[PDB]
Amino acid sequence: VGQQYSSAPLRTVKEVQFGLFSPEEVRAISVAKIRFPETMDETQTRAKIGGLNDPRLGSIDRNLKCQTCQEGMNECPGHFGHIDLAKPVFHVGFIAKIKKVCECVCMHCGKLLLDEHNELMRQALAIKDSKKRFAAIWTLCKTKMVCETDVPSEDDPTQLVSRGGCGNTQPTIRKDGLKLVGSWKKDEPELRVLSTEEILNIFKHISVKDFTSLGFNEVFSRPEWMILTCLPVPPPPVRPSISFNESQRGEDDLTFKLADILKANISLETLEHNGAPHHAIEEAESLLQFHVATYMDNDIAGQPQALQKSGRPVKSIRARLKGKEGRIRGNLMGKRVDFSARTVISGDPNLELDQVGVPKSIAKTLTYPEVVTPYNIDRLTQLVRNGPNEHPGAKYVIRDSGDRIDLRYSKRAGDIQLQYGWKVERHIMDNDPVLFNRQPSLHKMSMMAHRVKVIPYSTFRLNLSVTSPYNADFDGDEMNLHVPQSEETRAELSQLCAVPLQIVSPQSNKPCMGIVQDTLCGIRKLTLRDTFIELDQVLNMLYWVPDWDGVI
């Protein structure tokens, strides 16, 4: 994992502290500027321009380069870069909150609309629960639409007390696509679009004690931060390309949408530095907000799916995490794994309850890393000589010096003098405990540990009474097997989830495996008063019982 030693102390994660990125941090953390929307070709020459993807960020090419760091492809995680947007833009995700936060603070001055002076407010301001509190404070302030100058104190309602003041009626705000529009009113309304710059600023003035009251955080996430200024550029590892040989493209979906954001950006800025036909610059600003909004969420209410020339909608980052098949649920709550095998199953009335016949073909593939101990040097050496193609054998030797000898090529396979502390990846052998399972897996019992029994033919062979638990027939069902890779993992399998252990189930305080089909229908007959057995047979019937005290 990660490979190559690191003097760094290794600990586990104990807390995940969520928060929002302050623009000043992004700049700090960044390792590349990122000005050019192109990807590479130092004038068609294949490399990477100091412009987009790797102006010192991650890498490509199994080319150790990477701003000293080196290490190469696997090992170097990503290195972020930045991109100084030309104008403040919302963050699709927080449009809802920005809206509601404004409705809570008066513009122009930037202060709550209900001090401790107001009663009902006090109640809310007491509510310990960042989220439920902001929830309330809003219901009260949305309604208030004037930044009162003086409120009748908690005494006589005739004399009015002083607080902050600036009458400025507060515009009922509303949503239009990605814009917040408000309609003031004094004496018909006065409609005007609240600008980002404008709202960003009000926020920058919201009192530290006022964030907080409105579920925020002085260190980790102040409202003003829901407005992107400097944009973090994820490194190659996040949006890898695809290199079909030499003379061929391969840029990821995300790499295109950044180029778009970068393009749409250069556009704007160059306009505010030139013939700035004002109310035409804003035409170009809405664009920037469209991409920076789209690059994140691209399944918004005001439809315009932002399609890639080819009709395809362009995978928004959000898209990447949305459940099932998506990052969280598809890559973490569950994932494809190594040391696994699957194949058609078939019953076998000659395997003990807790075994599982495993096709040799499969046993010669799945391995187990046993460590060279004096307790087994001999055996292991035998398996190694034995090679990777005979059965009772092995297919990899790993010396302390992290490097694996491939027994099917290493010019010294027939050789090799093991070494205590070395590791031999050997074949699955009879009795290795393994996890056997049939899907859908809705039982602890749909996954049980079994003893391996390597056998001929290509099917997983399993004892009938263990049928029900998995709920399998032999009309073509397949079943998968997982081989534990560590000494304690097997112990966990054998000691906790072995089939024998799972016989009487909590599911309903009774056994979940009994006798079935042949044996059942047949055990009845064998029993009937009528049924008598004569010596010649009785003698065999007795011998079959593996325990029999040998006492006719």
Binding site: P440, L442, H443, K444, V504, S505, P506, Q507, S508, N509
Partner: protein, 271 residues
């Protein structure tokens, strides 16, 4: 959903059943602290029958010629008849058994007497018997104290919780209430002698197991009962090959788990 909803629930090292916040969902797992796989459907005799039959069974009157332990059953037969001090304990017993009978009829209003409880006491005795080759012919050698005091003493060992404070201790007595009614139900002086001719040895044995067995039945701190229950409910919902007319089955459970308002069938029964 059932799963994702209970993932994080497990029995902690204190027997409490909490989620990933330490919020208590059940003070003692399943209201008894017992592991499901260690429970069988036994029958609490005491519950049913006529008050008449109940008496003919558990009552022992050393002060009445016709209602004493015949000296055949016991070895200290004749010398116990009329013992006022023994008939004090022997009463205490019967007055408890009756208490129970009331309490059970309280709990299981129905009268239903077959409920799953740890330690199958019947088998434990069955073994006791043809393990010692007990003949329903000879007289036991149990003191009336032996029986009464042993059973009374055993219960002191059926530990589910182990706090050395009053709150916990009460909790303990609670969690064991029903098991005990079962225990006293089957280890009543009359029975232990007239029914199963247990001998002092056998008895000392039965008692010993009931204990061990019990202790083994308590749930293990670790048991992810969350998922277990999720799957235990969830699984049989998959096997649902779907006044009588009332929402039911899958569509109904979907109703319930959703705590939906308007339900297809919203009846109500008035007695």
């Amino acid at each position: 959903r059932l799963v994702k909803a209970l993932e994080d629930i497990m029995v902690h090292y204190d027997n409490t059943t909490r989620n990933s916040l330490g919020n208590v969902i059940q003070f003692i797992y399943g209201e008894d602290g017992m592991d499901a796989a260690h429970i069988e459907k036994q029958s609490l005799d005491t519950i049913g029958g006529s008050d008449a039959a109940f008496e003919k069974r558990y009552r022992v009157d050393l002060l009445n010629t016709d209602h004493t332990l015949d000296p055949s059953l016991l070895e200290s037969g004749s010398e116990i008849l009329g013992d006022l001090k023994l008939q004090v304990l022997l009463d205490e017993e019967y007055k408890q058994l009756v208490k129970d009978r009331k309490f059970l009829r309280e709990v299981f209003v129905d009268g239903e007497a077959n409920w799953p409880l740890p330690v199958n006491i019947r088998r434990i005795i069955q073994n006791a018997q043809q393990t010692f080759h007990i003949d329903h012919t000879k007289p036991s050698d149990l003191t009336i104290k032996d029986i009464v005091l042993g059973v009374k003493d055993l219960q002191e060992n059926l530990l589910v919780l182990r706090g050395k404070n009053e709150i916990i201790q009460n909790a303990q007595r609670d969690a064991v209430t029903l098991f005990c009614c079962l225990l006293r139900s089957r280890l009543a002086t009359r029975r232990v002698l007239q029914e199963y001719r247990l001998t002092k040895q056998a008895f000392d044995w039965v008692l010993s197991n009931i204990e061990a067995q019990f202790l083994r039945s308590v749930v293990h701190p670790g048991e992810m009962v969350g998922v277990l229950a999720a799957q235990s409910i969830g699984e049989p919902a998959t096997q649902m090959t779907l006044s009588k007319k009332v929402t039911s089955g899958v569509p109904r459970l979907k109703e319930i788990l959703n705590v939906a308002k308007n339900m297809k069938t919203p009846s109500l029964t008035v007695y």
